[PDB]
Design a binder for this molecule. Sequence first.
Ligand SMILES: *Cc1c(COP(=O)(O)O)cnc(C)c1O
Ligand SMILES: *Cc1c(COP(=O)(O)O)cnc(C)c1O
Lengths: 449, 449
Amino acid sequence: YTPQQRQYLESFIEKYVDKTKGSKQYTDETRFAHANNRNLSSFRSYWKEMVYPIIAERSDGSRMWDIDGNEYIDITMGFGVNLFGHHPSFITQTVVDSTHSALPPLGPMSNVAGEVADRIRACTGVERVAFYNSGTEAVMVALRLARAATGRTKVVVFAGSYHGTFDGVLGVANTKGGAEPANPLAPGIPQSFMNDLIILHYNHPDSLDVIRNLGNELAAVLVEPVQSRRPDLQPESFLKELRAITQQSGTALIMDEIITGFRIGLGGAQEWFDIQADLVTYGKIIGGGQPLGIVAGKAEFMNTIDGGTWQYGDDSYPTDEAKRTFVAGTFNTHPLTMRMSLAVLRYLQAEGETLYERLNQKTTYLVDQLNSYFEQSQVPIRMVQFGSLFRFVSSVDNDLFFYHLNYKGVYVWEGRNCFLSTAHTSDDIAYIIQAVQETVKDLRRGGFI
Amino acid sequence: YTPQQRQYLESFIEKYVDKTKGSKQYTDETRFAHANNRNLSSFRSYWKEMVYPIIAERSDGSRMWDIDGNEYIDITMGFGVNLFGHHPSFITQTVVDSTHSALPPLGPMSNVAGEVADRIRACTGVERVAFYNSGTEAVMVALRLARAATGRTKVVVFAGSYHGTFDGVLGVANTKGGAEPANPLAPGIPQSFMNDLIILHYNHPDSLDVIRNLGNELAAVLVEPVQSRRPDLQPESFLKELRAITQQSGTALIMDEIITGFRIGLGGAQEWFDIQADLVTYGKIIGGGQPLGIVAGKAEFMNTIDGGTWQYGDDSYPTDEAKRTFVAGTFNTHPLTMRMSLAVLRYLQAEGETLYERLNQKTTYLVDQLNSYFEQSQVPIRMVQFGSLFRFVSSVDNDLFFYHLNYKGVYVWEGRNCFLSTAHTSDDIAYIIQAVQETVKDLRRGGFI
Ligand SMILES: *Cc1c(COP(=O)(O)O)cnc(C)c1O
Ligand SMILES: *Cc1c(COP(=O)(O)O)cnc(C)c1O
């Protein structure tokens, strides 16, 4: 740092820590007892004094309040969960109803999950629907179903995708590239968990050749249709060709829609690109704020959950029993979660396409205004977008930029996926725009352009 | 079947189906759209007309009502989640509080997880606590932490244990026993996920020899201290030796307390056997009815989550950073879940040891009564027990026996782990005994002894 930059940083740190001193003290006091990876976010030794997560006390609509009483316009929105803002009326009413109703328990099967599955079919075109406890679990199950249905083991995923924390997806590409096995992402992940994993470049044509030439050996291609980390990469022709290749080879095309599902539109990315996957994973929005992961798709693959359907009154039996895999789960189809998922689906189906048109348009406005400002002021920042997911792209110190946004009342978690919600008003969008402009001005004054 | 047995079975199926015809119809009408392995429970082609799960509509205390309006004394209790029965007052109050408080959102870190971790440390003696979304996730993380801390890969589990649905624990012992690699439990689980897994006999003294002769090669021994499947096997000496062995070899002892934790007593199986593991997994009870899985244990192993603890005001830093692994999770430390967990811990800590003494004594009474009845009536059935967990062991057709119990209004899920709760009354226990005795008398009269 130049002296001018050092002087600015020291003054900013003092004001930042004073504003969020309670989050700092809570983090330091609980760090040992409560082990959490997020207590390392953007750690650097020379500014370790402002390296701590923001601790929340309250939320409502587009707003979050921290334990220092600071108010934020929230563009984290529960990592993408809170499409409708915090505590939408129909979610709150669902919880209120559950306190008065002698809610059925875990143990017996759910009396609501059937209608949830029906409405997911109506919204998305999937054939069969299964319920688990996180997006991570849903991805793990989806891979198992593809392998069980096909009798194969090898799976392709794309570099820069995120698919949860199942060890079988936690790899990085081989030194030699191609169809060679992955290496572990981190300590504690054994090489054996990488032997059936292949990581390829997304939207590189030669990846389509590797997959084509791998052919009948691949149990699945697992794709994040729009990768959250690069919202602007929307490779329709790559995805359509991937669909044609895997269909011909009998390989499961698994689309990870844990973010794009129920966000870009009611039918998710499948509907946006008009591509029907074999298996899809859903999560985040679809639980209504409750934890949820879903695997859904074509019977040819989903039959490995129950061995396939059959009827009463005849001699039918599960015809896919020889390919049925092992699945389970204590908290599957939780009674409150199923009622919240039902409330989300009821609301989305009643509100119709205009909900998404208005929300996507509101995000396009935010992205367009900021990109014009960056161009007008010659700032090396750019907004990228897919629907109501958006991100900042910059060569300025990203960590320093986001500390300013958070300081100015715009809450951005460390992973930096940003979302608008149906609860974000015109006033809120203007506030975000102003906070970004003041941040550019401040960093310019500090010598950080 | 003899004609006596055949006619009895035909009559039983007719009355069973008539009593639960709504659950049959709901299962039939939702089977395709809602894919769920539990729909295959106790399938046999010759009695398929009564093959369907019970669909629940209501619950309260020790009771559950199905969608036909039939009332049950529930001894499934959420697969062991519901230590206090359904809707204990302090849990309902937590849900009520959450609807009028503007709960903090997902996104920012939790303002309550510190106290939850502190109380778990006070209850169990663990040093550090981390929160994930299912017991399955907790076990998967715990294995990763042990592998990261030790730099080793191979893990021992014991046959007949259950540790969730992470593919890395879903194996059967090698056809040659001993220290050979496991094989997949089911289709869809690749052999690569088995190569770092070893499956040994539980409580056989030679299993400790095989572990001994493996030396420093094991990242961990994962043990279900009492296996849910065999509650009577409580091998204290075997566990004490297993602790001493792994301690000397620097191998992680991971105790899976997802069932025994907070059930046998406040400190779990660790407190019952007076053994301190390196890592422990909790789940089920500790979420208060919300989904939850926890990995906790000694800093030497838990430090792989955040790199180890540090302080503001000095030059300290994460000192285990080279061994830090990868963990994440959208729904970690969910605001409602953390508050329910806090409510469970506060209630347990206030109520004290007599809560467990009464509940364990109640279960012992039920077990002793039934075993006395079986002995006096010369019936080949026995009860086994660990605390408030109990199971039936019988050479009589188990599925037929349990169809009778369910028909008589005692709810037993297909997995047959049974539980009492603090809500089971004197009337409830007597009705459970009566249902079992009538079941034996009906079966004897039908020719099934
Ligand atoms: C968040 C996410 C996951 C993992 O979901 P969890 O519920 O956090 O396990 C997987 N895939 C994608 C695309 C996601 O955005
Ligand atoms: C239920 C259970 C698990 C898995 O827990 P889920 O929350 O269902 O994933 C793991 N281990 C043991 C001992 C259990 O009883």
